[PDB]
Amino acid sequence: MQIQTPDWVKHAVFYQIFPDRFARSKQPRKRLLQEARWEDWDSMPTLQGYKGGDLWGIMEDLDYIQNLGINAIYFTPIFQSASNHRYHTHDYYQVDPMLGGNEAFKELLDAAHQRNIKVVLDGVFNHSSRGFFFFHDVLENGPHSPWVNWFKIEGWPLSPYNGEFPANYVGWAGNRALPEFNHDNPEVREYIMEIAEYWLKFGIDGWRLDVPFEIKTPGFWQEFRDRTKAINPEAYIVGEVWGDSRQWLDGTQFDGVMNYLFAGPTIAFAAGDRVVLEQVQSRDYQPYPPLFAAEYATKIQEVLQLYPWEIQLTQLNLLASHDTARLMTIAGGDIASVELSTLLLLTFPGAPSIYYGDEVGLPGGIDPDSRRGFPLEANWNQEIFNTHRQLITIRQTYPALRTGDYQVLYAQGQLYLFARTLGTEELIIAINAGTSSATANVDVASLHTQPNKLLYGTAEAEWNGEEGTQQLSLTLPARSGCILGT
Amino acid sequence: MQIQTPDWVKHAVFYQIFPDRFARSKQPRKRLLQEARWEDWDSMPTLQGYKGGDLWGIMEDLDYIQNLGINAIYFTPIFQSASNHRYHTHDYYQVDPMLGGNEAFKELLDAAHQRNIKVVLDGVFNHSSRGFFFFHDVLENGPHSPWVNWFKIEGWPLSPYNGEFPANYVGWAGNRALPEFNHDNPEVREYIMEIAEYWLKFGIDGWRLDVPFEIKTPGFWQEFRDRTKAINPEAYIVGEVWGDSRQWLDGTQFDGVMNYLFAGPTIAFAAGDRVVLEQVQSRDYQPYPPLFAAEYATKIQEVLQLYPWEIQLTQLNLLASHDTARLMTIAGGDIASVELSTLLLLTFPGAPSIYYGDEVGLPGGIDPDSRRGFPLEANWNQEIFNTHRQLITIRQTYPALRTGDYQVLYAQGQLYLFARTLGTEELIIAINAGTSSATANVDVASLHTQPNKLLYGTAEAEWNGEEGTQQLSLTLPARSGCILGT
């Protein structure tokens, strides 16, 4: 049948958050031991003064979030794991008892929902942790464990914690702290499908699929989509696949991916040489080498004619992630690069994703730590913030920028002009990557109207001419962008 | 204030069960993956044909149980742990997902309760397991784990699984699979108190405290009793303390103990030389050397004048346990020893405890495995069964045998006579350990009545004489016992 994808995804702006570093709620909070005397409280140091952020924090700062204009939050992993290994799941059926509750998370959901803000969670199903119950059993019962056929065991004896031995079991990427599941095993596919159903029933609006391309068992993700959509047909299934994702985007598996194929070129064009190159997560995307308008267009037109349009409309566009360096940093502090990128990001077909912190001045190293991931402390970057908040209002104002088509009008030198059009609403977006005020004459025979009014980026160039096969000429300051409408 | 103890304990007969080996319910049972296609079921071997018993089984066999006359069941550990290390807790907040549910256990409770059969659970709070979440964290985060002060860590680096290293953390009895908690730590006392409250709220009728004498933090068990009694004032708190338990039986901690002080002498007298001595858990009790009536009496009178009577009435009397060899076995197959013991056990002040299997022929080694712990297969020992079922009806029939006083009338040679009296109801119990029909003349000036009618054990000796300071003479066959009433 027709390929379908959640229609709310198609009009959402996403905000990716890292719970442990985003926000910490006000003091009155029973952290690990709920049923605890407030008189004995100080007796327990861990709970007395806990630093890192929690789910109360996020919930306590929904005002901010909803004010930026974002209407769907999706985190990293928040399920119980090692204090600082969120990705080494210990228990999938419990939100971690430091940063969060199964009681806390519940309040965050409810809260979010009464504001029409969806919430997607990160599912890590390719591998768990040494602590994960069934693996634990194996470690404790060696050859006799009932679920030895649940993992990838080479031989015995295993050596889970001792480095200078073989552990005879496959990790994620040859790691012994990330025991890989044996997805071929029916029992396993089942246990996983249930975790997905459990949280959907709990009330989440979708799953973020982590390294989903590792799970190669045939028929897996189709089932994942059936059992999921069955519980909530409006659930969002996003895969965190790096490159070409056509394998999963045929309409019977994921609704979309985190579109790094869009992140690479956009930054390569908008920042060019300015890209630090040291913060480049070369694994995830290729923001390099620098691109010219003509090249950017070819690459984007390619990316665009890659997936069924229904899915392109529910693709998660981005420029940063927990896995990558922050935007402000990858551009070496170049505010221009930061405003030009976003502009493309918020005017591209699909769901735009904003990594918490980027809507303000906040930098972010690639390497482990980081950091700093409390947005607010202010001393914000008000301008880049206003750029973010302004562009988001606009995108939510003109439907074309969400589900209109994408047509390249001009793309020469360092100047790029495309058009988003839905119905009789046509918009012209122009980016001037160059350092010299640029100007271009374009034969706009495609359009049926004449976008004359500056939404956003303050052109001086415009002139716009007759209606016999119309005739346009733009002039934008160096390193500027703009949106033309009306 | 007055010392109080649950009054239902005072009139209950207990049945200790080992869930994994007791009973396995009928096929239709969604074992680990509830939400699983019955059409894919056979695809998952583990669930397809699981051997060991579950909580459905027990629930499915309540008829049997309630028919024996027992009215309160208390298990070993049933919380999630290694497939075969029930005592190495992995998660206290979940019944183990093989033998049991948090869904299954719920049905067992409800079921039990609608029959007025209480259910006590075994709490293992001195130590958990490598898998236990917070310990896991430590293992994963070494010196940086947030809860390093939750356990007994000597130094770094720890070596949880590698034998031929120091693991620098205290185990239970120098074991590295039983990480000991740091009970001095307030945070820990809290987490534990909550587990106790959680299950009480869930619906259990008491806790069996495992190796509670290891937890030496002052004020601990008093708090445990307050927080517990607070949620249910009729909750039963039993400590599995081996010997002299006066430290905990002052009325502000436990309601009782598993009275091994009663198990030792009783068997030492009732079986004598017949005690195998190879199955002797010499750690738990001393069923040895053999005792004469005069010695048994001195020891029992001692045991009896050891604890406040209110508590003696809520002591858990027994002759076997998961930790020990079964009754039939410890007596080397001597059925006499088995009938004489029970007789003393079911006529002693306090709650009698029957280890599943003993109410029938079933033997049981001391060593690890066992076994066999499905009672039924029949081929029962009908007689010893009828002895059990008969003695239980009687004990429930005459209140004196539950809360009456204990007075020794005669105790010479291998003949022993005591009297349970409550109100105007007086009972005479006589045990003839010897191998030669014995007879004794006793000056019964204590009694106010004249038990002339044979309840149970078929005396020939009786004669009973006048009421001027009355005058009794019994004659019992060798290795026999009897109960005199009316």
Contact A46 B90 (CB under 8 A): no
Chain A nearest-CA distance from B147, in A, is 8
Token pair belonging to A130: 């040494």
Contact A131 B129 (CB under 8 A): no
Residue B447: give its domain's CATH number: 2.60.40.1180
- The radius of gyration computed from the CA coordinates of chain B, to the nearest angstrom, equals 24
Chain A nearest-CA distance from B79, in A, is 12
A345 and A480, same domain (yes or no) = no
Beta strand pairing call for B14-17 and B351-355: parallel
B475 and B356, same domain (yes or no) = no
Beta strand pairing call for A118-123 and A206-209: parallel
* Closest Cβ–Cβ partner in B46, B83, B139 for A161: B139
What are the b/e assignments for B193-216, b being 16+ CB within 10 Å?
A: bbbbbebbeeebbbbbbbbbbebe
Chain A residues in contact with B194 by the CB 8 A cut-off are 33-35
A386 and A470, same domain (yes or no) = no
d(CA B387, CA B359): 8
Chain B nearest-CA distance from A369, in A, is 15
- Of A31, A81, A107, A100, nearest to B194 by C-alpha is A31
d(CA B178, CA A359): 49
d(CA B449, CA B446): 9
Q: Which residues of A are catalytic?
A: 210, 240
Interface test with A, best of B161, B162, B168, B182 (most A CBs within 10 A): B161
Contact B133 A80 (CB under 8 A): yes
Chain B residues in contact with A140 by the CB 8 A cut-off are 82-83, 85, 88, 129-131, 177
Note the resolution in Å, 1 decimal. 3.0
B448 and B312, same domain (yes or no) = no
Please provide the DSSP assignment of B162-183 as one string: -TTS---B-BTTS-SSSBBB-T
B407 and B379, same domain (yes or no) = no
B362 and B465, same domain (yes or no) = no
Token pair belonging to B170: 């205290």
Contact A133 B90 (CB under 8 A): yes
| Residue A16: strand, helix, or coil | strand
Neighbours of B383 (CB within 10 A): 13
B284 and B424, same domain (yes or no) = no
Q: Where are the alpha helices (DSSP H) in A156-259?
A: 186-202, 220-231
A389 and A406, same domain (yes or no) = no
At residue B289, what are phi and psi to the nearest 5 degrees? Answer: -80, -175
Residue A160: give its domain's CATH number: 3.20.20.80
- Of B131, B127, B175, B167, nearest to B151 by C-alpha is B127
Which residue is listed with tokens 């969806």? Answer: A118
Contact A140 B80 (CB under 8 A): no
Half-sphere exposure of A420 (CA within 13 A, CB side): 25
Interface test with A, best of B34, B83, B148 (most A CBs within 10 A): B83
Rounded to 5°, angle at Cα B437 from B479 and B386: 35
Contact B130 A139 (CB under 8 A): yes
d(CA B211, CA B340): 29
* Segment A200-203 long-range contacts (CB within 8 Å, at least 24 positions apart): A200/A228, A200/A231, A200/A232, A200/A235, A201/A231, A202/A106, A202/A109, A203/A106, A203/A109, A203/A110, A203/A113
d(CA A100, CA A86): 12
Of A366, A397, A428, the residue at which a domain comes to its end is: A397
Beta strand pairing call for B480-485 and B453-455: antiparallel
Beta strand pairing call for B405-412 and A236-239: unpaired
B467 and B359, same domain (yes or no) = no
Contact B140 A131 (CB under 8 A): yes
A72 and A211, same domain (yes or no) = yes
Chain B residues in contact with A43 by the CB 8 A cut-off are 186-187
d(CA B423, CA B446): 13
Of A371, A397, A423, the residue at which a domain comes to its end is: A397
Contact A140 B194 (CB under 8 A): no
Chain A residues in contact with B52 by the CB 8 A cut-off are none
Q: Count A/B contacts: CB-CB distance under 8 Å.
A: 124
Residue A134 makes CB contacts below 8 A (sequence gap 6+) with A147, A150
Among the listed residues B210, B284, B339, B359, the single catalytic one is B210
Beta strand pairing call for A72-75 and A118-123: parallel
Element (H, E) at A121: strand A118-123
Residue of chain A whose alpha carbon sits nearest to that of B47: A187
- Of A474, A486, A481, nearest to A425 by C-alpha is A486
Q: Where are the alpha helices (DSSP H) in A233-376?
A: 260-270, 293-304, 309-312, 327-330, 335-345
d(CA A259, CA A284): 10
Contact B91 A88 (CB under 8 A): no
Contact A145 B83 (CB under 8 A): yes
Chain A nearest-CA distance from B408, in A, is 50
The domain of B443 spans 398-486
* Closest Cβ–Cβ partner in A85, A139, A145 for B161: A139
| Residue B88: strand, helix, or coil | coil
Chain A nearest-CA distance from B232, in A, is 16
Element (H, E) at B93: strand B89-95
Of A397, A417, A436, the residue at which a domain comes to its end is: A397
A302 and A435, same domain (yes or no) = no
Task: Check: CB of residue B317 under 8 Å from CB of residue B262.
Answer: yes
Beta strand pairing call for A405-412 and A72-75: unpaired
Q: What does each C-alpha distance from B440 to A29, A332, B56, B462 come to in angstroms? A: 73, 105, 51, 9
B411 and B348, same domain (yes or no) = no
Contact B130 A140 (CB under 8 A): yes
- Of A113, A116, A119, A138, nearest to A128 by C-alpha is A138
The verdict on whether omega for the bond into residue B218 sits within 30 degrees of 0, i.e. cis, is no
Token pair belonging to A141: 């019962």
Residue A233 CB-density burial (10 A; 0-12 exposed, 13-18 middle, 19+ buried): exposed
Q: What does each C-alpha distance from A125 to A227, B249, B331 come to in angstroms? A: 15, 51, 54
Q: What does each C-alpha distance from A42 to A49, A114, B389 come to in angstroms? A: 9, 35, 55
Neighbours of B251 (CB within 10 A): 17
Among the listed residues B240, B255, B334, B426, the single catalytic one is B240
Chain B nearest-CA distance from A132, in A, is 8
* Closest Cβ–Cβ partner in B32, B46, B85 for A140: B85
Total domain count, chain A? 2
Chain A residues in contact with B136 by the CB 8 A cut-off are 82, 90, 129-131
Which residue is listed with tokens 């068990």? Answer: B221
